Amino acid sequence: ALLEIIHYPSKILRTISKEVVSFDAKLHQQLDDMYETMIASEGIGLAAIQVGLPLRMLIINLPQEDGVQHKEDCLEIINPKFIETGGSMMYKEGCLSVPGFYEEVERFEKVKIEYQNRFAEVKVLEASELLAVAIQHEIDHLNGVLFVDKLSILKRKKFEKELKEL
Numbered sequence: 001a002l003l004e005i006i007h008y009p010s011k012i013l014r015t016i017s018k019e020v021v022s023f024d025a026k027l028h029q030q031l032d033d034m035y036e037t038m039i040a041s042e043g044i045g046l047a048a049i050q051v052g053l054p055l056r057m058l059i060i061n062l063p064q065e066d067g068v069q070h071k072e073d074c075l076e077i078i079n080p081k082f083i084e085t086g087g088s089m090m091y092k093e094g095c096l097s098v099p100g101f102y103e104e105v106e107r108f109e110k111v112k113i114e115y116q117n118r119f120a121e122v123k124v125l126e127a128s129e130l131l132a133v134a135i136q137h138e139i140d141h142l143n144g145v146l147f148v149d150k151l152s153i154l155k156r157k158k159f160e161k162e163l164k165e166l
């Protein structure tokens with residue numbers, strides 16, 4: 001089922017999500033609803049709090065060569081934790097909870113994370129570029145952080161201008 005997407009400046013997006021402890025049918029349905037919700041709004045990443053669920057889980061489904069998304073490559077990361085991070089790069093980001101606004105944010109160009117899939121299986125994943133950016137962006141949501149929070153002095157002003165624009 002489709003779930004309501006929470007938009008900035010809702011205080012709900014500042015929540016610190018909690019670890020998932022029961023990987024059951026209920027959790028799986030929330031993940032399915034999240035995927036259905038992300039696609040319907042044409043996003044490539046979505047954190048649980050963006051739909052009102054203060055849980056430490058998020059999904060990422062980057063499009064392939066053809067430019068289309070295949071539910072097969074969808075990553076479901078629960079209880080993530082950074083093992084290592086390195087480098088630095090700028091990436092223009094967007095967010096379903098801040099529709100209509102896109103701005104460059106500084107991110108690590110490489111990260112290694114540890115997490116669990118929907119079946120509680122432990123995984124270790126190394127990522128770079130786009131995938132590494134999505135991971136950092138989504139994980140920020142779990143800690144109540146939005147990418148507009150990480151904007152430089154100037155860009156923050158541009159955000160306010162464009163915000164007043166809508």
Ligand SMILES: CC(=O)Oc1ccc(/C=C/C(=O)NCCc2ccccc2)cc1OC(C)=O
Pocket residue numbers: 041042043044045046092093094095096098099100101130133134137138
């Ligand atoms: C008007 C407009 O274009 O609004 C949108 C803005 C962003 C998005 C999607 C953003 C998104 O998936 N971000 C994932 C996290 C990420 C950040 C940077 C690089 C990789 C991954 C969708 C929109 O469409 C609707 C219908 O709300």
Ligand SMILES: [Co+2]
Pocket residue numbers: 045094095096097137138141
């Ligand atoms: Co986001």
